[PDB]
Design a protein around this ligand. Structure first.
Ligand code: K
Ligand code: K
Ligand code: K
Ligand code: K
Ligand code: K
Ligand code: K
Ligand code: K
Ligand code: K
Ligand code: K
Ligand code: K
Ligand code: K
Ligand code: K
Ligand code: K
Ligand code: K
Ligand code: K
Ligand code: K
Ligand code: K
Ligand code: K
Ligand code: K
Ligand code: K
Ligand code: K
Ligand code: K
Ligand code: K
Ligand code: K
Ligand code: K
Ligand code: K
Ligand code: K
Ligand code: K
Ligand code: MG
Ligand code: MG
Ligand code: MG
Ligand code: MG
Ligand code: MG
Ligand code: MG
Ligand code: MG
Ligand code: MG
Ligand code: MG
Ligand code: MG
Ligand code: MG
Ligand code: MG
Ligand code: MG
Ligand code: MG
Ligand code: MG
Ligand code: MG
Ligand code: MG
Ligand code: MG
Ligand code: MG
Ligand code: MG
Ligand code: MG
Ligand code: MG
Ligand code: MG
Ligand code: MG
Ligand code: MG
Ligand code: MG
Ligand code: MG
Ligand code: MG
Ligand code: MG
Ligand code: MG
Ligand code: MG
Ligand code: MG
Ligand code: MG
Ligand code: MG
Ligand code: MG
Ligand code: MG
Lengths: 46, 38, 77
RNA sequence: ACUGAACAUAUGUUCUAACGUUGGCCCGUGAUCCGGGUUGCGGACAGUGUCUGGUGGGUAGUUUGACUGGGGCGGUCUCCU
RNA sequence: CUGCAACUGUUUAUUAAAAACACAGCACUGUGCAAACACGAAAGUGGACGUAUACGGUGUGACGCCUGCCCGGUGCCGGAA
RNA sequence: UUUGUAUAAUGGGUCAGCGACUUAUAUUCUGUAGCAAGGUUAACCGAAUAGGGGAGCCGAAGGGAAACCGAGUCUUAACUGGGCGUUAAGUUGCAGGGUAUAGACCCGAAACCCGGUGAUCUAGCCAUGGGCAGGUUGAAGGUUGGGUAACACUAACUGGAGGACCGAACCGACUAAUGUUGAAAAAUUAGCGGAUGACUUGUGGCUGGGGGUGAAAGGCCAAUCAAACCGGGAGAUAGCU
RNA sequence: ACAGGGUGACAGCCCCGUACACAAAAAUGCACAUGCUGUGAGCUCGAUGAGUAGGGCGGGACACGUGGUAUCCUGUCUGAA
RNA sequence: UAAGGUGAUAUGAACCGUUAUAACCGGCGAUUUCCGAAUGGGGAAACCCAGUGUGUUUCGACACACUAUCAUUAACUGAAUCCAUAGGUUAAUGAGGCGAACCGGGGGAACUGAAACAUCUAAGUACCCCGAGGAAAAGAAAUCAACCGAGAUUCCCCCA
């Protein structure tokens, strides 16, 4: 059966990547929260 | 609005006369035309 | 924005109040109009977005005096 | 309120100068935006603000009793003998 | 032999595929264009680079024969002394 | 937990560890200690757990709505009256019981609101690419002959229409059995429907939560939908267990 | 100097410290002293904040829910001395 | 400051040093790839693609430096349109991003309490947004008081 996760790296980067996050103030707030928490990986960006 | 006429205006008065006109008359016609001043 | 360039009047919030005193939030907007003002000194029309109140101020103080205040505050026209 | 002028007898007609233009042409300009200009057409109307009557399950917050030989329906709910 | 739906389609991913939805066709109604209408405090955008033989809403549901009476109620339309 | 449980009512497989009446401030009462018609200081000052600081607070007088009067006072025109008072114990710590405000003994909703994250599943749409073995049927149109005043009409051939037919791929999902701690959180096997279309599919794009999208089932929006998910208001509230 | 830590057990005198007394080439904070540049104090004579105060309408903030309701703020319409 | 040492894992390898350029510690410097406000353009962060000017060249090529936007100011230029203005170009200066709390301002819930609930409460709280500083804000009476007087603001204890 077709499951929900159907990977596309292009779509992943466009939806959730670093530049997508930086594009909006709410995205920048995501990065600030993740830096504050001290995540090793800020985004899906490879 | 009190204005000083700089020209003969009909049903109003002659040069150098103080007269009370509606603000729109002054603002939009008399003053910009140069027929009166405040 | 709905802001008077002469007076700085802008939307303020308040309540509607029913007979039963139910409060619902509302805004009060300024009575704004775009108006072409004859600037005798500069031999031209200037357009300002002004409240009716601002127009009474301009009548009283004169456009030249008002335009000076705009230039001081750094508001273009 | 922004919103003015004549004229006739609050009402109408006319006017242009506010205001509108999702008409045309010119310029910024390599631009179906925007602004300015010129001109036409509307024109104190339209439209917007504040106030105000109406309408308003379109939307929202809520309410919609208790007793009871289960609950509902019916009856009852205070006072007097 | 017979009910239902004209028909091909669509639907409750994971208990319902149907007589439900849609449908061509029909009718009523709104809409003169900056259209009605819709998204949007707005600017705008869709409707449409369309213009009443068009567009939106509503109901009915191929086709055949047809579609009676009631305007009191509720709505809508019109009148205004 | 109950009127009542060996109950066939509840809970516990067992062990170990953890797991529920607290804290702050105010207030009242009891005990106890100090001082006593008085008791005590707060902030602050002070290196000072000292000392200063008496601003205040409580008490030693009540009555009356109040002015006001005062061991009385109020009521009344006035009391033989009647109500409330009058006979010195209070106050500040410390410990405790209760109350108040706070999550207030602990655990537990369904929900409500705010800000974000999601259309890699799915719904619709947009752009750009791809797919549909094989076999049938034989619309319009045309040609020729017949036929007509000319049409009309008519036979054969040609032609190749269609949400046309049969049927694989592909897309679906009607029946049955199996499976149901599965091979699988929706499948397998045998049959079944559509299969040139209102078809199907790849890649990318757009629509966002009272919002989308919906040939409409309240369907679908990441195995979640009569209001998604994540975080927050937040220890919501729980007259219930 | 009995702060504390370490050392083959729980060390004043084994070690590192501790009390106490000293220390800066360089950069730098702070407090005073003093060059320089800018600065106008003081005195005299004036001036004395208008679409403002106040008001009507609608709201809001003041402990104060518009109430008999002062005062404050102002979206709207006005408007002094 | 020193007889040891080159950070640890970590063992050894090659070494450095012992009276002062071993090492270690402190002051001041130098170097400081790429991404990131990211600023030469673009972009699926850590990559792709340039322009201009200086040089250098073994003619294969190479190095270095500039090149964002916006605001302000100045200069020059410059439409419709005669002046002008809009616009354009260059230069100088500044800004942007990040940050736990505290602070000022713009917006602003609901659960909840009221033993239901609508006024009211929760609460101008949570939250969103803008701005700022080492603190912020407030502040020098068109203030109170009560016929006596006080003398800006802020904070604490009372009043209660
Ligand atoms: K015009
Ligand atoms: K009008
Ligand atoms: K309604
Ligand atoms: K009974
Ligand atoms: K019974
Ligand atoms: K049948
Ligand atoms: K039928
Ligand atoms: K079916
Ligand atoms: K259906
Ligand atoms: K009727
Ligand atoms: K009727
Ligand atoms: K029981
Ligand atoms: K049971
Ligand atoms: K107590
Ligand atoms: K006591
Ligand atoms: K008595
Ligand atoms: K005592
Ligand atoms: K308690
Ligand atoms: K796709
Ligand atoms: K929702
Ligand atoms: K999910
Ligand atoms: K021992
Ligand atoms: K020791
Ligand atoms: K006023
Ligand atoms: K960069
Ligand atoms: K509420
Ligand atoms: K309650
Ligand atoms: K309720
Ligand atoms: Mg409702
Ligand atoms: Mg509620
Ligand atoms: Mg009952
Ligand atoms: Mg039958
Ligand atoms: Mg059917
Ligand atoms: Mg079918
Ligand atoms: Mg199903
Ligand atoms: Mg089925
Ligand atoms: Mg039907
Ligand atoms: Mg029982
Ligand atoms: Mg027994
Ligand atoms: Mg048993
Ligand atoms: Mg049992
Ligand atoms: Mg039970
Ligand atoms: Mg059990
Ligand atoms: Mg007394
Ligand atoms: Mg077919
Ligand atoms: Mg399906
Ligand atoms: Mg099968
Ligand atoms: Mg078939
Ligand atoms: Mg249903
Ligand atoms: Mg799902
Ligand atoms: Mg809901
Ligand atoms: Mg709360
Ligand atoms: Mg809870
Ligand atoms: Mg031992
Ligand atoms: Mg006043
Ligand atoms: Mg006022
Ligand atoms: Mg007043
Ligand atoms: Mg008022
Ligand atoms: Mg860039
Ligand atoms: Mg760059
Ligand atoms: Mg490029
Ligand atoms: Mg309640
Ligand atoms: Mg700073
Ligand atoms: Mg300050």
């Amino acid at each position: 059966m077709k499951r929900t996760f159907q990977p596309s790296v292009l779509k992943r980067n466009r939806s959730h990547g670093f530049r997508a996050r930086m594009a909006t103030k709410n995205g920048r707030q995501v990065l600030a929260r993740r830096r504050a928490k001290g995540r090793a990986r800020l985004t899906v960006s490879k | 609005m009190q204005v000083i006429l700089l020209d003969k205006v009909a049903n109003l008065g002659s040069l150098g006369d103080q007269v009370n006109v509606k603000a729109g008359y002054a603002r939009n016609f008399l003053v910009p035309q140069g027929k009166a001043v405040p | 924005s709905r802001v008077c360039q002469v007076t700085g009047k802008r939307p303020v919030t308040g309540n509607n109040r029913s007979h039963a005193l139910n409060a619902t939030k509302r805004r009060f907007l300024p009575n704004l109009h775009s108006h072409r003002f004859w600037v005798e000194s500069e031999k031209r029309f200037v357009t300002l977005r002004v409240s009716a109140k601002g127009m009474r101020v301009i009548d009283k103080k004169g456009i030249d005096t008002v335009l000076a205040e705009l230039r001081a505050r750094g508001e273009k026209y």
